[PDB]
Design a protein around this ligand. Structure first.
Ligand SMILES: N[C@H](C(=O)Nc1cncc(F)c1CC[C@@H]1CN[C@H](COC(=O)NCC(F)(F)F)CO1)[C@@H](c1ccc(Cl)cc1)c1cc(F)cc(F)c1
Ligand SMILES: [Cl-]
Ligand SMILES: [Cl-]
Lengths: 99, 99
């Protein structure tokens, strides 16, 4: 698909058996989801951006389905104001910016 | 151009006759630049990011070139960690997300 940017590029994702809405964010290095349980090992991480830093849990090798495309990668879980799909997963679905 | 996301989508911008580097950010509603002088009057604005909210100065109808494409619109100035080109200007340059 071709997604215009007149509104926030929100899409449905499937993660940890749950359907959620998330923002396709080219400015994010990482994928960050609001509090939820994920299986496996995790380690703490700090991520920064506008407003400063938040502490999150880093889960590796998490399968995700984004707008119907399956991928795998690291998923961070913590107090983000919005679920964001960052570059680490956007690359896997072949997402590019075009102008 | 077509920009992949294996690395940060950093581009050159020109504002106030000066070249700067900025991130093309589909997750950002607005465009926010690090401290600099801009002409005219400004209005107050609060923006929220991954770590919370920050106060910025809102300047309207600012001429800005983004990766060689001319835009004229709102630019926020404040304590952002990186210069961000958000949707307000990505739409002016005809940028879309594609996969
Ligand atoms: N309204 C909010 C917004 O648009 N804020 C905004 C506006 N204009 C310029 C900006 F910059 C911003 C800050 C966000 C941008 C998003 N992409 C980058 C993320 O990357 C890093 O954090 N670090 C990497 C590096 F930036 F440092 F490089 C840079 O921060 C929006 C939002 C809030 C937080 C986040 Cl995370 C993403 C989106 C939102 C809030 C909500 F509650 C519900 C929603 F649907 C949408
Ligand atoms: Cl990853
Ligand atoms: Cl590729």
């Amino acid at each position: 698909p071709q997604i215009t940017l007149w509104k926030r590029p929100l899409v449905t994702i499937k993660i940890g058996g749950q359907l959620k809405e998330a923002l396709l964010d080219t400015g994010a290095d990482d994928t960050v989801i609001e509090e939820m349980s994920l299986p496996g090992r995790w380690k703490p991480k700090m991520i920064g951006g506008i407003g400063g830093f938040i502490k999150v849990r880093q889960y590796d090798q998490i399968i995700i389905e984004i707008c119907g495309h399956k991928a795998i990668g690291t998923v961070l879980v913590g107090p983000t104001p919005v679920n964001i799909i960052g570059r680490n997963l956007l690359t896997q679905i072949g997402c590019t910016l075009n102008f």
